[PDB]
Amino acid sequence: SKLPLLTENGGRVNRVGFTRLSREGSIHKFGFFYEFTQESLDFDSDDQLK
Amino acid sequence: FNVMTKMPGKETADRNDPYGETGFSSIKWYYGILVKRPERIAVMKAVAPL
């Protein structure tokens, strides 16, 4: 019941449409940190703390 | 004029801003005057129309 059947007379029959969808993205940001004193790195028990 | 710019990066990092994002640009200058003969400067005050 939906075939694009055409007659010998032609005419404005069987018109179609189209569409374009679109995507989307986004850039975010992240980050942390940590402080440390010198007297916790030189006078400590492990030389490889840092 | 003295202009001191510190572009954001390694030169703006501190324990207050560990990530280093905010920079600035400061313009500082000296100015003075020595009126030697104020007898030669003349002013005249009056109102003006709209």
- Strands B24-28 and B2-6 turn out to be antiparallel
Instruction: Give the A window 14-43 contacts with B, CB below 8 Å.
Output: 31, 33, 35
Asked if A8 has any chain B CB less than 8 Å from its own CB, the reply is no
- Tell me the CA end-to-end span of chain A in Å, nearest whole number: 76
The technique is: cryo-EM
CA atoms within 13 A on the CB side of B18: 7
Q: What's chain A look like in SS3?
A: CCCCCCCCCCCCCCCCCCCCCCCCCCCCCCCCCCCCCHHHCCCCCCCCCC
Structure's resolution in angstroms: 3.6
DSSP state string for B1-50: -EEEEE-SSGGG--SSSTT----EEEEE-------S-TTT----------
> Are B20 and B13 within 8 A, CB to CB?
yes
